[PDB]
């Protein structure tokens, strides 16, 4: 009866920072996935457990679109079993991940002469995130052995820092918009389908 609202992600004016990635849940709607891949607009389009051209033939309980902005040469961490401060401390994909990772260069939207510093990532955490976990806390990290008790200090650090995107950066340090589609088939009725 309804079109799925994925355009609110792929045509969004602004994206989330990777530490606070947005999750949009999709249900009770139909969607034509041909429209994504036939755009050819995505320089990263890799699917795990599913096949882009077979997505119109399936139905799922839910689909989750996670969106956020990272730096060009961190895109490779958005994949099963990667390490680095993005996969470890900001957005972790499971090893059994079933879905698609989509990405594209957003230098024209997210870079400004002077530097856009509005996008942030978590540099410090006591442990890795678990798959699909989301940590938005802003408590002073303790890189030494002294309770920072809520203030930055020697070996005591605020856990977030800024990307700083300028148009003249090299591609490795240009902003990329990422959408991770997750496909979920539980015991409940599958409401998300393609033209069929």
């Amino acid at each position: 009866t309804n079109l799925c609202p994925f355009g609110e992600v792929f045509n969004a004016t602004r994206f989330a920072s990777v530490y606070a990635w947005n999750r949009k849940r999709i249900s009770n709607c139909v969607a034509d996935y041909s429209v994504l891949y036939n755009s050819a607009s995505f320089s990263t389009f890799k699917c795990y457990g599913v096949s882009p051209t077979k997505l119109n033939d399936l139905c799922f309980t839910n689909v989750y679109a996670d969106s956020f902005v990272i730096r060009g040469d961190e895109v490779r961490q958005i994949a099963p079993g990667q390490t680095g401060k993005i996969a470890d401390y900001n957005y972790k994909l499971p090893d059994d991940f079933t879905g698609c990772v989509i990405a594209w260069n957003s230098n024209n939207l997210d870079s400004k002469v002077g530097g856009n510093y509005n996008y942030l990532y978590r540099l410090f955490r006591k442990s890795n995130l678990k798959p699909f976990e989301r940590d938005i806390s802003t408590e002073i990290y303790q890189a030494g052995s002294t309770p920072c008790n809520g203030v930055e200090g020697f070996n005591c650090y605020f856990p977030l820092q800024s990307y700083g995107f300028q148009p003249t950066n090299g591609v490795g340090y240009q902003p990329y918009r990422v959408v991770v589609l997750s496909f979920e088939l539980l015991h409940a009725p599958a409401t998300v389908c393609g033209p069929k």
Partner: nanobody
Amino acid sequence: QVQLQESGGGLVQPGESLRLSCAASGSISTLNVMGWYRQAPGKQRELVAQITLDGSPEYADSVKGRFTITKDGAQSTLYLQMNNLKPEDTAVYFCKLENGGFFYYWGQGTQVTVST
């Protein structure tokens, strides 16, 4: 990849009728929603009329009963038939197309001016 051209804008007297056309082209999915929108100056873009996915038309309250929206399947044209025009219908009119549920597109708009 998807293009939309509005036509039929122009000058109309209050009480007269006018039909607008939106030719859509490019790689249009079978799953798409088209609509007509308008924007008077100083005001924000406002939904005017659309046809849901299941086919049933919907109208803004300000035009309900005076406007008719129809979709010519063969000629991929969305029509807005506007009857008993009033001076408050003066605006730039735009069509929208939501393609497959992943992208949406706008036309450039055409000017409808209602004046004696």
